[PDB]
Amino acid sequence: DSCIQFTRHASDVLLNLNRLRSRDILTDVVIVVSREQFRAHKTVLMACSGLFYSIFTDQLKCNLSVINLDPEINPEGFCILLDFMYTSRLNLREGNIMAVMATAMYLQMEHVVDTCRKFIKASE
Amino acid sequence: DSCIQFTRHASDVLLNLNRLRSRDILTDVVIVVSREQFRAHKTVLMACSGLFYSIFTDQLKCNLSVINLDPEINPEGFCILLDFMYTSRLNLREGNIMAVMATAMYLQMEHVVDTCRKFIKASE
Amino acid sequence: WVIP
Amino acid sequence: WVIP
Numbered sequence: 001d002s003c004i005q006f007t008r009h010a011s012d013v014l015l016n017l018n019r020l021r022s023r024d025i026l027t028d029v030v031i032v033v034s035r036e037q038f039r040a041h042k043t044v045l046m047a048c049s050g051l052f053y054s055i056f057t058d059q060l061k062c063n064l065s066v067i068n069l070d071p072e073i074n075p076e077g078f079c080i081l082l083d084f085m086y087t088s089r090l091n092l093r094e095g096n097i098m099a100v101m102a103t104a105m106y107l108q109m110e111h112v113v114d115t116c117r118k119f120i121k122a123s124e
Numbered sequence: 125d126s127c128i129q130f131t132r133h134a135s136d137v138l139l140n141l142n143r144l145r146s147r148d149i150l151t152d153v154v155i156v157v158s159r160e161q162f163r164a165h166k167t168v169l170m171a172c173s174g175l176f177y178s179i180f181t182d183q184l185k186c187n188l189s190v191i192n193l194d195p196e197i198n199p200e201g202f203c204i205l206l207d208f209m210y211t212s213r214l215n216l217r218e219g220n221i222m223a224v225m226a227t228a229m230y231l232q233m234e235h236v237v238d239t240c241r242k243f244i245k246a247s248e
Numbered sequence: 249w250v251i252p
Numbered sequence: 253w254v255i256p
């Protein structure tokens with residue numbers, strides 16, 4: 001086509017989606033990770049995660065308002081990844097890298113798994 | 125903070141949101157523009173438009189599944205802008221620029237209004 | 249705005 | 253990935 005493109009559009013959309021999340025506006029699911037709960041938008045979760053894409057395209061699970069993750073999933077690891085989904089920013093630290101990588105593998109977030117593997121290999 | 129950032133994340137999220145829209149997955153509103161209907165996600169509309177941000181933060185309108193636009197709004201103009209919302213790509217042409225600009229003004233999409241004004245000024 |  |  002002969003379209004023009006607004007460079008910052010995708011980033012501005014994501015910034016607004018994060019603002020809606022912070023104010024709990026039109027959030028439609030709560031992700032339970034052991035004792036912790038995280039409110040989010042199903043569409044954003046599906047757009048970032050192979051696991052959530054699978055869950056919310058399921059004819060029964062698409063209608064659930066609560067999703068319980070595997071008890072082995074670390075809440076801090078999940079929190080860091082949920083923030084990444086809504087911001088493109090990953091708070092990767094020596095103290096959390098193992099939990100972040102295991103959570104990214106479970107959530108099926110290939111690019112996060114890739115940078116975790118690379119940061120781990122550099123430290124060995 | 126000490127975060128790392130994935131450059132393509134925002135664009136990949138938007139590409140997936142557009143894929144969900146095309147397959148009518150978790151769309152939660154229909155925008156009626158005279159004889160035409162457009163299915164979309166409320167969160168994406170709010171993230172792109174001052175008008176939709178106002179509508180869906182309203183305590184009554186947030187729960188509506190159908191929103192009827194002003195009868196003066198051109199469906200093709202709306203279609204071009206809805207595509208822009210989900211892709212960052214604006215199909216701006218001599219034959220549609222007036223309708224696109226009027227629709228962008230109504231929807232409160234300042235950057236689109238700005239490029240329309242500039243393209244119009246260049247042709248006078 | 250750019251030509252993509 | 254970059255340093256933002």
Ligand SMILES: N#Cc1c(Cl)ncnc1Nc1ccc2c(c1)CC(=O)N2
Pocket residue numbers: 043046047048049050051053108109110111140141143144
């Ligand atoms: N929502 C949506 C969606 C759609 Cl519509 N099409 C294709 N992928 C989608 N999302 C999704 C699927 C697999 C993975 C990710 C996201 C990130 C990753 O590492 N794996």
Ligand SMILES: N#Cc1c(Cl)ncnc1Nc1ccc2c(c1)CC(=O)N2
Pocket residue numbers: 016017019020167170171172173174175177232233234235
């Ligand atoms: N959703 C959301 C939203 C939030 Cl949370 N905060 C601030 N703006 C939001 N969206 C929004 C408001 C005004 C305008 C646009 C988008 C584009 C434009 O030209 N005007």
Ligand SMILES: [Cl-]
Pocket residue numbers: 063064065066
């Ligand atoms: Cl439920």
Ligand SMILES: [Cl-]
Pocket residue numbers: 048109110111112113
């Ligand atoms: Cl990823």
Ligand SMILES: [Cl-]
Pocket residue numbers: 187188189190
């Ligand atoms: Cl309704």
Ligand SMILES: [Cl-]
Pocket residue numbers: 172233234235236237
């Ligand atoms: Cl805009």
